[PDB]
Design a protein around this ligand. Structure first.
Ligand SMILES: [Cu+2]
Ligand SMILES: [Cu+2]
Ligand code: NA
Ligand code: NA
Lengths: 620, 620
């Protein structure tokens, strides 16, 4: 019944049929992206109309198309031919991964480079990596992947332990031509294995860990209705899933007495980029846009009960499309559970004699994705006290290289002859805000120091200041941890009982933003990552901070183009885009498999409620 | 057996007997501080000599004394007379707090001020607060407390809802004299109650929360021997307790194969200051040194199973002295338990076909203290992967004032006419480091951005720089979040298998430090709080960042005087002092009882191990 329900297998099957009959899905066609469109702005939208947006690739070389389909009415709404040299290439197809290794295996230049290193071509795996946009004029308008090689000594060997440095190849995956093979010199292939399940490396497993049993004898406190509508401890929201963004949260609201109060209309991780900081020509082009180029939702893991998600777990199993339009279910792809979160509030009062303790809890919505060597967990948390938090968990296997004799300023040594180049992992959260409704504004809040003097005779006073961001051209902001900088999203037309506008405060981790030179290709293509906070006026088609077609786009798409419109954002329907990330100098302890590291942000109420919203939590 | 065992009731009774026999503990004497001394440097040393440090107050006005006694030998080792006008007053005694309200109730100036406000003296509670050092010459060498008034409408009423602004009194608690009563004008006493257990305010309690059951069917994975020695998942440490500092961690070491590797010799929160930022003369003197002035261990709560600590809990019940030298047990004052901590490492490899998931856990050691309106939780965490983390949790009732009719730049409004002055909560962690032994050094690590050009033609490279701090005069450092600044504690004489010095990296939260004007009294007394990191050479008598006697002491002691010695810290026995804190602009949601907010720091291994230390964790 709800317009925000997950796509069903039947809907995807109908989309396939509609495309088929319209002549848009022949044997040369591949679906590179398929997803449901959100309803357009309308606080009275009545008619059911489920629309899907489709990116159609052509393996014969014809122009790709963007198509919009109505599954309710069984019609093609629009179909546009795309000029990819202008607006960017389509996302990478899973089937194009195999093509890189297969094409190189018969290329004379590749084979000669392997022969010089005495490597059996049957043991060389090639990581197929996005190309970016650099100096190679012949690549404009062509679909290019670049390949880096790793040796697998046997079928269950971790190939990441054996990078083949000094060698990179470029491949046109449509015409199936190897355009360049670059061999800069022979590096020893690191010989130690990195097989973290080999007992010779692990040693005897510990026998010291006793079990922790987490159960809910009466079942969980949340309800799920309509497939994906959650109600939990005054919170209300819909859990969506998109093959590009992954888990998307819709309609986050809080029941304050009898009123359902909106907080966030749509929350997602709209892009994530992994730029590498090694200036070697073998890797100096390396930048993954995991969301925009690869689509993190299509690589979501099936999560195992008791291992990935522990406790009383409710699963969602989203449905996506494969490259031919068949529905594919991601079994147990989303875990949902509540967990104890320590003390919520506590006071022992000498004068009243009352001792008071309450416990906190959080609702967890999570999924995990695997993109080549890395694995990322995306966690959304809702707390009893109104706090909303996102946390990314990075693990997997670090991307490796040779460690040069004589050392390096841009690569860590992990094992003899084995290096790991410096890199970042930078996320963009897109928060379509709706604090008590759509009339919102953003203020930047800095701590203010005051000088000792008249009105401050003891030199103890300090204060704060708030600056309203009124137009998009002034809404590109940087962090300042030293002045305690935060950003408040308020509704100037909705006041609390003290006659102050209701608000939520965004707390950033204040980690470094993109480190690349401002003139670099990656700074132009990932401009969002150069600043901590952006605010735009809502528009239906401004979905991603990097634009719709990130792969091999020359730069400037997304946020810098949106912001240039310089629209009014003071008491309007606005979108907050928060950049946050990890700067990873790999350590020895990250090898051969990396313990989780985390980054995130959170939002806390700031005069949204008329008093603490957790006075009605029982002692239990 | 162990020299680091908790003090026993018998040891405290023996200290009392030794002091009595020596003529140092007659009827006019009070014990203001008593604690066990750590063994001096020297492995083995004196077989067994348990020594105690005692601060003895004299209620007749004679000079107090600092005394060291050997309980093993039954002897006074030293006893020095203190000149408090020079070196500071002793910590506040619990029995002095009651004196303030009683004395004021019979003072004609106080009664006249309350009569002017139509307040019944029987309903007026007085918060007795530390005095600091300001402009009042008559306070030098006297024990002064300052009192602020709150109305309690009935015996179970929260008096914090009803501050009596415009009024403060100063009391000599030894002479039992009211020195000054200052009345700057009548403010309305806010009338709304703040009774968070009153059903009229809470509304009906939630019935939606279903139970979460956390059990360990086979018991916990850690062992406790000798009363306070912990072994857990390769970690080894001793849990100490001191009436000033609270929980102290000793001898933190990690069992790496067959070798017990030291990491931290002693970890404690050695001071915590709460400065207020309201320039009103009624409160501009207000600064709590909860550790140095009040002694946070003295006010530790008894923690209730299933409410304060949830799961399979092991308790310690530390013993402290009362003011007469009698042992007092704090029943269930320390909770210890292990917690599931989500995913530890995870990877699904396309090439090898191996799917791998491991779960994390942490050991938790915690205690809670209550000092007037505030309640603070102190949490130490040990993780499987070698990470050590501290977290402070702040809750309780915010300190209140009137809210002035025309608004305020230094006070938040919480309720009609009710204000909450801005303040900070700032901690100092003292980490006596022992990374693989006592030969350590500290390096400051910043990210280095590189310009596009020769050797960086694509403008993608970035790097890092490490600067060794070689002498105390250069080891006073500031955070820099924009450059990703961290500090590495390494051992230059102990290398990992890659021939790099082993180390641990300190990750700060990069919150603002002390905001007061540098010329202020509080900036001089809390100089540690003005910088994020200090490094000193170890010395037995350099225990607290504020010195031994903080109460009513001007500047001149503590960290600024220690670092003036300019000692070699490059590969020496060193101590790291880390300042971290919360800047609190109270929100409506903090009233009438504050949901927990948190701050802390963590240390992560940085090439301490030769590879990941959790390869031997089983799948379960
Ligand atoms: Cu990384
Ligand atoms: Cu506070
Ligand atoms: Na909006
Ligand atoms: Na040391």
């Amino acid at each position: 019944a709800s317009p925000f329900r997950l796509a069903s297998a039947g809907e995807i099957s109908e989309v396939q049929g509609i495309l088929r009959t319209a002549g848009l899905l022949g044997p040369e066609k591949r679906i590179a992206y398929l997803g449901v469109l959100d309803p357009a702005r309308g606080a009275g939208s009545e008619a059911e109309d489920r629309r899907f947006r489709v990116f159609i690739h052509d393996v014969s070389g014809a122009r790709p198309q963007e198509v919009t389909v109505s599954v309710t009415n069984g019609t093609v709404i629009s179909a546009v031919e795309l000029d990819t040299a202008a607006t960017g290439e389509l996302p990478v197809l899973e089937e194009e991964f195999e093509v890189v290794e297969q094409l190189l295996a018969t290329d004379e230049r590749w084979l000669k480079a392997l022969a010089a290193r005495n490597l059996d071509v049957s043991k060389v795996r090639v990581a197929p990596l996005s190309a970016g946009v650099f100096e190679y004029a012949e690549e404009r308008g062509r679909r290019i992947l670049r390949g880096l090689a790793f040796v697998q000594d046997f079928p269950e060997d971790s190939a990441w332990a054996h990078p083949v440095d000094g060698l990179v190849a470029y491949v046109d995956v449509v015409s199936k031509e190897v355009t360049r093979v670059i061999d800069t010199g022979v590096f020893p292939v690191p010989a130690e294995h990195g097989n973290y399940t080999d007992p010779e490396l692990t040693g005897p497993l510990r026998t010291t860990q006793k079990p922790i049993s987490i159960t809910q004898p009466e079942g969980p406190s949340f309800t799920v209705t309509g497939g994906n509508h959650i109600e939990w401890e005054k919170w209300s929201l819909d859990v969506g899933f998109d093959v590009r963004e992954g888990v998307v949260l819709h309609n986050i609201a809080f029941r304050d007495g009898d009123r359902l109060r909106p907080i966030i209309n749509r929350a997602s991780i709209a892009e994530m980029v992994v730029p590498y900081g090694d200036p070697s020509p073998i890797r100096s082009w390396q930048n993954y846009f995991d969301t925009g180029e690869y689509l993190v939702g299509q690589y979501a893991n099936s999560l195992e009960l008791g291992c990935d998600c522990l406790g009383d777990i409710t699963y969602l199993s989203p449905v996506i499309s494969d490259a031919f339009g068949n529905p594919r279910e991601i079994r147990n792809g989303i875990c949902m559970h509540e967990e104890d979160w320590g003390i919520l509030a506590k006071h022992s009062d000498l004068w009243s004699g009352i001792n008071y303790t309450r416990r906190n809890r959080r609702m967890v919505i999570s999924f995990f994705t695997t993109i080549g060597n890395y694995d990322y967990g995306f966690y959304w948390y809702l707390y009893l006290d109104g706090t909303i938090e996102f946390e990314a968990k990075a693990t997997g296997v670090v991307f490796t290289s040779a460690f040069p004799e004589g050392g390096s300023d841009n690569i860590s040594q992990l094992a003899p002859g084995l290096g790991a180049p410096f890199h970042q992992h930078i996320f963009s959260a897109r928060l379509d805000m709706a604090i008590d409704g759509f009339t919102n504004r953003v203020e930047e809040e800095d701590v203010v120091r005051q000088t000792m003097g008249p009105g401050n005779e003891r030199g103890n006073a300090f204060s704060r200041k708030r600056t309203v961001l009124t137009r998009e051209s002034e809404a590109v902001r940087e962090a300042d941890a030293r002045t305690g900088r935060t950003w408040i999203i308020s509704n100037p037309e909705s006041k609390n009982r003290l006659n102050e506008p209701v608000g939520y405060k965004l707390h950033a981790h204040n980690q470094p933003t993109l480190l690349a030179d401002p003139g670099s290709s990656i700074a132009r293509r990932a401009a969002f990552a150069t600043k901590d906070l952006w605010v735009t006026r809502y528009a239906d088609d401004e979905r991603y901070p990097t634009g719709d077609f990130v792969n091999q786009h020359s730069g400037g798409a997304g946020l810098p183009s949106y912001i240039a419109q310089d629209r009014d954002i003071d008491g309007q329907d606005i979108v907050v885009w928060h950049t946050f990330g990890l700067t990873h100098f790999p350590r020895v302890e990250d090898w051969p498999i990396m313990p989780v590291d985390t980054v995130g942000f959170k939002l806390r109420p700031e005069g949204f409620f008329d008093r603490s919203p957790v006075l009605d939590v029982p002692a239990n």
